[PDB]
Symmetry: C2
Subunit: 374 residues, 2 copies
């Protein structure tokens, strides 16, 4: 019995190479650090769906294609008015994707080309859905997308009601690129497991959202923000760290389960976060984070325990206007590209129905006892 | 690489024993034939959730508990008014479960007891959701549940607007018992894969519905009904069969991928279907089916190729008032009990995050080529 399917390889892939021991992460062979620094969510999405970087003309048309698809149908925006505002944002997203599928006249078409086109629609619309949820949570109206803005800049615009600075847009753009893909994690696997019966794309993506909503996957930066809230103020941060280390207690965001050395995604984000802080000001959360980074680093750096991407992303989203409950939704806004890419790849290279089993340890030949005899 | 996870055992279970070669199917050790003939959907559901048959008092209270939970909240019934009536019934169900979760004040509670209680709520409500969809497809209003009727009888009542005869109720009751559980098939596995991140029950069940919607799982009787429609009339059935056999072409519903001999679920259903036909009349579909059964049987029976449960269930549902597009939804109305039982069991016996992987066959050290150089 292969508990948790640990060590089990069930298919082949060309999408994501992960070497946790050496700190390497590639998207179709290209290092994530290069993409986060030089690419855009649109270009990286093209890479994840096509397997190669786009030529200039291809990128322009691709970005425009996504931009035109950002707006949600009026039918869905109307439904959002009654979606419980008190509900978990991931449940809002889960329902939105499912209901949206009902509006597709050819919802069940799963030809490669149909999956690709419906996929572009979902990639463009995810940011709009999440931003709408945020606006409604604030008692405000969702904001129509601005096609002149990039996917990342428009996401911030629709979420906050104001166009972000170039620095803020670049920070969010990098964050999305950094979380767009990560191999066969739980949500990507669930998407494939669902798609293996040849169900429609909305069904597979709804299953992915359902998986991602779980605390065991896609919620790492929540623990870091909870730590920051526990610290409360910058003035107590340094002392808090000392006490934690003295008690041999773990510091959230330090070290990683997969990346034994450096998390290849952390560096670019830390730098861009600094640039935003220097232009827009250092938030209370940012100040606390930097003190923890420095004080904890004095002891952890020599031990090879470095801050990972989750150590920075939560503060980044907070600084960009988002609350903790929207962290996983933002993760989904990025990961939808990886999910679509994985569905296209699985269909192309494997496409088999998944048929795992379980070792039977139950009983046999148990009698159907008459009701009165029990 | 274990393609399709074929032959891979990832956990242990006591719920369902399947011996396809010998035609055996047990629910917690009890033969399915016994349950289909002597049990009720309520009692079999108790068995699937508790691991044992209920005592008289337990069964009475359990059945009453489910009955009280059949009614859907007004908020959801209101939302149903705008759900696209043209949409796939499984997409309607997928969305209903997801939206319903948003109404649960403690949606994310996954303690064993919470999963059980929320599970009872979904088991009771699934029939109501599907019946509502059917009514709306007919331009009619959903019908409030009648707590005095059994789960199966009430399902027919809410779907057709009239209380079924004892024969019809017993037929549907048996059909539900027969499809309530079947080990680690695709939808049950997807439910577990999603739940492995400790996401909420609605998320896991929505993922299960997404999986079940696919044509590769839970749609076997559709092919049989399509065959019947192709035949058109009873007068052409016998000749149609001869031509098919002469061309060495397969007869839908004959033989089974798993059950090499008898499908242990077929016998009880065939008998109850006959009793309904004898009291309410033989439909065109039933007449065609019986002619196919007899004519094809002359050649297939000696070869050990017998009609399976899917050969009868489609006609059964049609005779009970349902269209082909509602066959899988009915399957879900029954399977929800197995899904909930599986989530409870997985949590109790394993509860591990699933972490399968893929063999990397992609490229490494691919350069991030400047835009103009592509």
């Amino acid at each position: 019995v292969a508990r948790g399917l640990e060590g089990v390889l069930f298919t082949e892939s060309r999408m994501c190479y992960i070497d946790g021991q050496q700190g390497k992460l590639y998207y179709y062979g290209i290092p994530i650090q290069e993409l986060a620094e030089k690419s855009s969510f649109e270009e990286t999405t093209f890479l994840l769906l096509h397997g190669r970087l786009p030529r200039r003309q291809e990128l322009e048309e691709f970005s425009a294609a996504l931009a035109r698809r950002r707006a949600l149908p009026a039918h869905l925006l109307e439904s959002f008015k009654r979606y419980p505002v008190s509900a978990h944002p991931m449940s809002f997203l889960r329902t939105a994707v499912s209901e949206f599928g009902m509006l597709d006249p050819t919802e069940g078409d799963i030809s490669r080309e149909a999956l690709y086109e419906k996929g572009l629609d979902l990639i463009a619309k995810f940011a709009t859905i999440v931003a709408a949820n945020k606006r409604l949570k604030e008692g405000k109206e969702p904001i129509p997308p601005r096609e002149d803005l990039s996917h990342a800049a428009n996401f911030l615009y629709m979420a906050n009601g104001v166009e972000p600075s170039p620095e803020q847009a670049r920070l969010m753009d990098a964050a999305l690129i950094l979380h767009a893909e990560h191999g066969f994690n739980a949500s990507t696997f669930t998407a494939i497991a669902a798609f293996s019966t040849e169900t429609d794309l909305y069904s597979a993506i709804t299953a992915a959202v359902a998986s991602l909503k779980g605390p065991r996957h896609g919620g790492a930066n929540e623990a870091v923000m909870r730590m920051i809230q526990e610290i409360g103020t910058p003035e107590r941060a340094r002392e808090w760290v000392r006490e934690k280390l003295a008690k041999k207690e773990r510091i959230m965001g330090m070290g990683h389960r997969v990346y034994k050395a450096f998390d290849p995604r952390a560096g670019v984000l830390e730098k861009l976060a600094r640039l935003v802080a220097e232009k827009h000001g250092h938030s209370k959360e940012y100040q606390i984070l930097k003190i923890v980074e420095e004080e904890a680093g004095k002891v952890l750096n020599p031990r090879g325990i470095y801050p990972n991407v989750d150590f920075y992303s939560g503060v980044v989203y907070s600084d960009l206007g988002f609350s903790l409950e929207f962290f996983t939704p933002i993760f989904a806004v990025a990961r939808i590209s990886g999910w679509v890419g994985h569905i296209l790849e699985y269909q192309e290279l494997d496409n088999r129905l998944l048929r795992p089993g379980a070792k039977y340890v139950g009983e046999l030949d148990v009698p159907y006892v008459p009701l009165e005899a029990r």
